[PDB]
């Protein structure tokens, strides 16, 4: 039988010229690739943006392999053609509003979208045909041969695709005109390259209904026709994400770790590690330091370039020897392990659980944030939101169950030093989704927690397809269908539909969360602040014999905020590798320093100047790519901002006395970055 | 035959207790009246507001007189009963959007609402029954007898009134629940008192938009039926109008609505045959005016504006720099120079822009520059000729007197006038006293009423509104939402005199301030203005060691600001209605407590609306504003008007040092006061 890799492709949006793109990373944490005129990868990316400051699309190369794992191309003996059919769709406008973990069936049927009352997006549209038309679906496109190109355009929808849909005409805010979901190409030997959207994000309100973006996902079909006209067919999936603004920095739990974990616990991917008959990991499984543990430590060690998480420093200091498996070092390994949060169970209404605990202790001397130190998958809504009393809460991050099992085996001394055998997972499969966020997912960046649900897969790393080209040709896509509920596979648009519509809202808010740590069932509460003030006046320096009566009055103010983080609260990151927050300035020449208004080497806010959600929707592409300036020298990283469109931004230095009224404060100033709409 | 006075009553909104009211002024520029328990007027008003800072309603007393001009009351010998029926309504939500002079048929049929394509308010409602239901109409109420009271309430609509309408349920913004248009009472002798609304303004859309908004302004018909001992009866009619508060009742408008009715009367109903020839349509140049009756009030009114606006260029028109009562030849050149500084009236012809009311100054030659008179906005200083998809939108930039006032001023100038008492005009004092306290000009749209009042077709005679149909017709049909009384010419319905005004009226009040008026292009009031600033930044570094140099750096940046409709320069700062919506007024608190709360010393001129920083705040907090009043009223001829009764406690205050704005701490020797409303109080 044939196989296509990667099993889940990953492309990234870009607004540069349609013909100006990079190719996929070839490993987790790898840079994307420049290419030659044959569309073969050459060197790692030189610049992420074009000269005009537009972000280049990143495309995914897919390859097809025969029974003995040899690659099939148009040059293979006995191959006369290879035809790729890709069907991408965006179902976001047709899906439910995002309400954290509501709708996630891993918590049981009582957490279904219907049982939780989650409203549909664009809720005034209630007939099925009206819901279907909210989907962006241009039908499938096909590509085959040497150096082919075809757009997934509203202008070349096949005649056989009876139900296309898209936001038509001139949109009233953001991007005006939707045109394309991306481009399919082949290289010089017939391999597929899928390129995604252009960063379109527009709608007809200011508010939020009737909005769209050009994120998409869907099916990949490959038909290889042999010289005698027989054929074989094999499938994969494809996902488009917004730009990876720090591609060398890897998420502690990636989506590859997610697929792997789902695989181990549900598809017998690693029989030695987990006993599928009983539903437990095997305590005799021996982990491997370099394969299983080291990546966690390395990933933790790079968050400092995009966030302030210094409390994690002890987990990569090598204050003791992480490679020493002896009894003498066991107390040390166990102490390291015991600082990681165990996983919550997935039971509705159970709040007092390890992911609601912030610190090791609150006794002075014994205070450390537990690990990894980041938000969990619901630090936003309390138990009592949305007219529920048992809304699922998950305040703080944990590793996935498989990572954590393997870490425990390390802690126990059940691990080796030296080479391990690879798991039965292709490296091409890990290289795509290993660059996507795995946790937390609220909703996340590329994908959300449907990817944790084994019912969407036909085997580890492989998305199950619902139906086929001939079905969708006649019927179109099914707007209300939940692949997690039906269990019979995914439709185009299913992997990305749950994310924010438009994505730049995920991006604007993927920063930090201020998370309560005193009441397990509470994230936010109403806060009433009453300030009662008595003003008393007296007059003096009066002549002898003169007096004037004092005067006094009382005033009060009452401020009510319906939903604010309950104190005491902890400053917690969301997705530092995918949405940086605290970064170093990198302009080393006078011109870049004048334009950026900053010296090099200073830590500042990554998004400075993008002061509103509407600005992010329009100017996302102006932001920097965080990159290792010392990449040639392994082990001595120096990550700074590169390629920020500094000219977009204006700048004012406000003296502190401007705010306070005290001119002595003007010895200190506050830098303010912003975007003036009136600039040319 | 009976007659009812006033012909057109005027009441004013108030949010104090329903039982806490003052009665109508008795003369033009008169204070309203306190009253006794019989509801008879006593002495002029003490406080305009109650102790809680809520404005007291002003009610209108109506009286009915017999064929001898003798007043009839329940105490009159041959009188068995007097029964009053008042039908007030608010048609504002069912009328057209206000678009300055569009719809005004005095400019010809080509200026009709339909020819001009003016849209309806709440334009999504198009069936006649749905338009009708936008009207606030609770039917008529009747009152008779000694000390009666009946509310114009949603809870006492007569069963015979088949189509009442009003905004039901809870409104989403501003006032939540509509309940009443006002109160009818009788006094101890059976006279009518009409009190109007309570200041309700609410709607279902956000004004920060403005569809499905309502206020409790109203107007409508008054019917009096007098029944005699023998059970015979006679009937007579009047009209009634409710306006927002008069915040400076002692200060009179240069042209009042009494002047409007008078002018309309002279020109169209033969009210004064010796002044105007109705067969040829011209004034009579041999009419001899009277200084005290005709001229002096203009001069006096001009002289009061200084208490509420900065109009110092008008000072020469009341200085007595020469003798205004000298009608001799030797003084004619002076009287003529005075008259010639007044704007003549524009002709109401579409497309004719180069006319006297587009002219600001006597000239722009140094030494010969004076703003023409009266110096104020006209009835369209807002929209240009090319607005609203039109090419010949009617413009009228600057104020003129009315045609009658100006005729009489010219008779003065020519020396055709008397000193001494005059013949009164055949107009009751009781008719001038009501509407003489309303704005007559300009009307864009105005305050109480707008330019329909200038149209003779709504009148059956001078000062008398013509009634369309009758009580039975409205019992069955309700009111006619689309009907223009000015187009049909067969009379007014309840709601017709106020429906054109802003909905809610607090928009008219928020904007009745000043206008920056272009005076270079007669067809233009506003234009788009594009300001492009192109900036080259250049850097050089110096004081470097010997042999060291670094290159200069430079770059270029630009901003392009586009405002779509702003006054076209050069422009002139022009008032709207200083008497009715004050702008520059004197602070009035003479004791320490009032000064601490106000944050100001007494005697300082400051902005009247300070702290009301948005339209939405005006809609909520109109009633906090001051009444401008003569603190020296006991001493005739020595006025001293200041704010009184401002609800200072509503407002917060910040003193901003100028260096907070500029970045230069040396500028901190100077500060700017900023008043505002913190909703979290
Ligand atoms: N995946 C990130 C969502 C951010 C949530 C936001 N700060 C909130 O409190 O609503
Ligand atoms: N200032 C307003 C009009 C004033 C309305 C007064 N009667 C404008 O430019 O629209």
Swiss-Prot record, chain B:
Contains 1 cysteine tryptophylquinone per subunit. One of its GO terms (biological process) is defense response to bacterium. It comes from Marinomonas mediterranea (strain ATCC 700492 / JCM 21426 / NBRC 103028 / MMB-1). The gene is lodA. Keywords: Antibiotic, Antimicrobial, CTQ, Oxidoreductase, Quinone, Secreted, Thioether bond. This is L-lysine 6-oxidase. Its EC number is 1.4.3.20. GO terms for molecular function: L-lysine 6-oxidase activity; quinone binding. It catalyses: L-lysine + O2 + H2O = (S)-2-amino-6-oxohexanoate + H2O2 + NH4(+). It is found in: Secreted. Its cofactor is cysteine tryptophylquinone residue. The modification Tryptophylquinone is found at residue 577. Has antibacterial activity against a wide spectrum of Gram-positive and Gram-negative bacteria including nosocomial isolates of S.aureus and Pseudomonas sp. The antimicrobial activity is due to hydrogen peroxide generated by its lysine oxidase activity. Also has autotoxic activity. Involved in biofilm differentiation; responsible for cell death within microcolonies during biofilm development which is linked to the generation of a phenotypically diverse dispersal population and thus may play a role in colonization. Coiled coil: none annotated.
């Amino acid at each position: 039988a044939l196989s296509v890799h990667p099993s889940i492709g990953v492309a990234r949006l870009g607004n540069a010229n349609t013909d100006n793109f990079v190719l996929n990373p070839m490993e987790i944490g790898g840079l994307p690739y420049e290419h030659d005129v044959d569309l073969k990868p050459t060197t790692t990316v030189v610049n992420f943006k074009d000269e005009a400051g537009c972000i280049r699309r990143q495309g995914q190369v897919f390859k097809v392999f025969g029974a003995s794992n040899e690659e099939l191309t148009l040059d293979s003996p006995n191959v006369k053609n290879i035809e790729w059919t890709v069907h991408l769709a965006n179902k976001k406008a047709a899906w439910y509003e995002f309400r954290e973990l509501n709708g996630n069936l891993l918590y049981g049927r009582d957490n279904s979208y219907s049982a939780r009352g989650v409203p549909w997006r664009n809720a005034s549209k209630t007939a099925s045909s009206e819901r279907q038309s909210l989907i962006i679906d241009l039908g499938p496109r096909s590509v085959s041969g040497v150096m082919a190109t075809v757009e997934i355009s509203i202008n070349n929808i096949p005649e056989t695709y009876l139900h296309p849909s898209y936001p038509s005409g001139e949109l009233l805010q953001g991007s005006k005109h939707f045109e394309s979901l991306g481009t399919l190409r082949t290289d010089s030997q017939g391999r597929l390259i899928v390129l995604g959207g252009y960063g379109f994000a527009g709608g007809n309100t200011d508010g939020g209904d009737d909005w769209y973006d050009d994120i998409s996902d869907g099916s990949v079909t490959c038909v290889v026709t042999y010289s005698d006209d027989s054929s074989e067919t094999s499938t994969a999936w494809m996902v488009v994400g917004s730009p990876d603004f720090a591609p060398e920095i890897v998420n502690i739990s990636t989506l590859s770790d997610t697929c792997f974990d789902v695989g181990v616990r549900n598809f017998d991917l690693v029989p030695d590690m987990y006993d599928s008959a009983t539903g437990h990991y095997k305590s005799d499984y021996v982990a491997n330091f370099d394969r299983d543990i080291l990546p966690i430590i390395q990933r933790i060690s790079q968050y400092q370039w995009v966030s302030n998480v210094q409390s994690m420093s002890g987990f990569f200091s090598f204050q003791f020897d992480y490679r020493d498996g002896s009894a003498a070092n066991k107390a040390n390994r166990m102490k390291y392990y015991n600082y990681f949060r165990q996983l919550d169970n997935k039971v509705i209404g159970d709040y007092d659980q390890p992911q609601q605990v912030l610190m090791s202790s609150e006794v002075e001397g014994d205070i450390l944030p537990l690990m990894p130190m980041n938000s969990g998958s619901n630090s936003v809504s309390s138990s009592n939101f949305y007219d529920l009393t048992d809304n699922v809460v998950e305040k703080f991050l944990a590793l996935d169950a498989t990572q954590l099992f393997l870490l425990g085996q390390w802690a126990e001394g059940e691990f080796t030093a030296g080479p391990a055998d690879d798991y039965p997972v292709s490296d091409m499969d890990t290289a795509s989704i290993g660059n996507c966020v795995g946790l937390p997912m609220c909703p996340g960046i590329e994908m959300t927690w449907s990817l944790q649900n084994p019912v969407i897969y036909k085997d580890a790393y492989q998305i199950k397809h619902y139906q086929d080209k001939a079905y969708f040709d006649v019927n179109g896509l099914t707007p209300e269908r939940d692949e997690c509920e039906e269990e019979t596979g995914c439709e185009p648009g299913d992997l990305t539909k749950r994310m924010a519509c438009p994505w730049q809202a995920d991006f604007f808010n993927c920063t930090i969360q201020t998370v309560n740590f005193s009441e397990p069932s509470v994230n936010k509460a109403s806060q009433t602040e009453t300030v009662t003030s008595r003003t008393h006046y007296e007059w003096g320096n009066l002549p002898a014999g003169v007096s004037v009566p004092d005067q006094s009055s009382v005033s009060a103010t009452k401020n009510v905020d319906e939903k604010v983080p309950l104190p005491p609260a902890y400053y917690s990151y969301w997705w530092p590798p995918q949405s940086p927050w605290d970064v170093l300035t990198g302009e080393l020449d006078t011109e870049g320093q004048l334009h950026s208004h900053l010296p090099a080497g200073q830590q500042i806010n990554y998004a400075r100047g993008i002061n509103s959600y509407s600005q992010m929707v329009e100017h996302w592409s102006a932001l920097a790519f965080i990159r290792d300036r010392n990449q040639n020298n392994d082990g001595f990283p120096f990550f700074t901002e590169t390629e920020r469109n500094h000219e977009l931004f204006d700048f004012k230095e406000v003296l502190v006395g401007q705010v306070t009224g005290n001119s002595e404060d003007n010895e200190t100033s506050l830098p303010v970055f912003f975007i003036n709409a009136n600039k040319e």
